[PDB]
Design a protein around this ligand. Sequence first.
Ligand SMILES: CCNC(=O)NC[C@H]1COCc2nc3cc(F)ccc3n21
Length: 340
Amino acid sequence: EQESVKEFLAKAKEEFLKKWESPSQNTAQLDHFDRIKTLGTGSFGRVMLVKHKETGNHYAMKILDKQKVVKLKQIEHTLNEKRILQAVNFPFLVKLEFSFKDNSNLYMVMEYVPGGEMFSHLRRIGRFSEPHARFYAAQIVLTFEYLHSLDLIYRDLKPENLLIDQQGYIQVTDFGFAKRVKGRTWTLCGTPEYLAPEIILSKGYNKAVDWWALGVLIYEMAAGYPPFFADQPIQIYEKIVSGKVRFPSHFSSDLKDLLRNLLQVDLTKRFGNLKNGVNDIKNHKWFATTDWIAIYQRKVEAPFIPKFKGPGDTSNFDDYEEEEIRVSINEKCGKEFTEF
Ligand SMILES: CCNC(=O)NC[C@H]1COCc2nc3cc(F)ccc3n21
């Protein structure tokens, strides 16, 4: 990195630490918003499109049921997610605008990104050209350079978590597994196709798992399917730990070389985790045409501009059963979520 990048990252870490040490809390409430539509769902939570009543602005509100968070043993992960999101700031990360809790739920009110998930766009077109995959990959490389310099591991890279904005740039969402780690960590988390071998083998692992996941993402963007695909998790895990991969013949030689270095089973040999860190990736011949500054400054014309009618359009997200959001008259799990 040149000194200007070093100085940028030093400032970025100072600004992160100030918010990390003194987190914002309780900056909105539920009856300040109208409920519009469910944008996505899960085991302990739900993401809703909402409209702020006074300003008219739209947001994506993630709602977690405290009792379900406790039962699924996600308390620490949920506290990590909110504490990290209120402290980070980067062009390719979805912004947290407000957060609050009530007797029943935890709420994170995020910017709403109307272009949909990368996953939908990838599945609909089949695969991305190498330049198109490279444009998105470059944004992930910069985002992981930022997060890793703050000692954060992201741990949930997959196409569903990359939203496409109006300008065709990626914004990364879902910090549910992100953690501040200055050395190793041990939790089994992540989607099967994206897990590094050291996670599957129950080892203490580090930020190298995010570089592995980038290799899986680039492969899947350029092929249309992930490199260790199989019908059941145990078979996926066997392929991941094997040390072999098959590349489509249409992949360029430079793409294959980059992917063999990201998908290196030995974490001590994996690109992103060597002495030169991220620069082995940024200087790789597959990225030779990438202007890293221009990508950061959002000056590159994107390959694809999502079609949508306005900031309240939900057409790029799919339809889910609409369930209500209840708030008990009795406080649940107050102690567990005191810091939220
Ligand atoms: C039928 C439409 N109902 C609302 O607009 N209700 C507004 C408030 C209070 O009532 C329960 C409730 N659940 C919500 C979920 C949201 F995502 C946003 C606001 C929500 N509210």
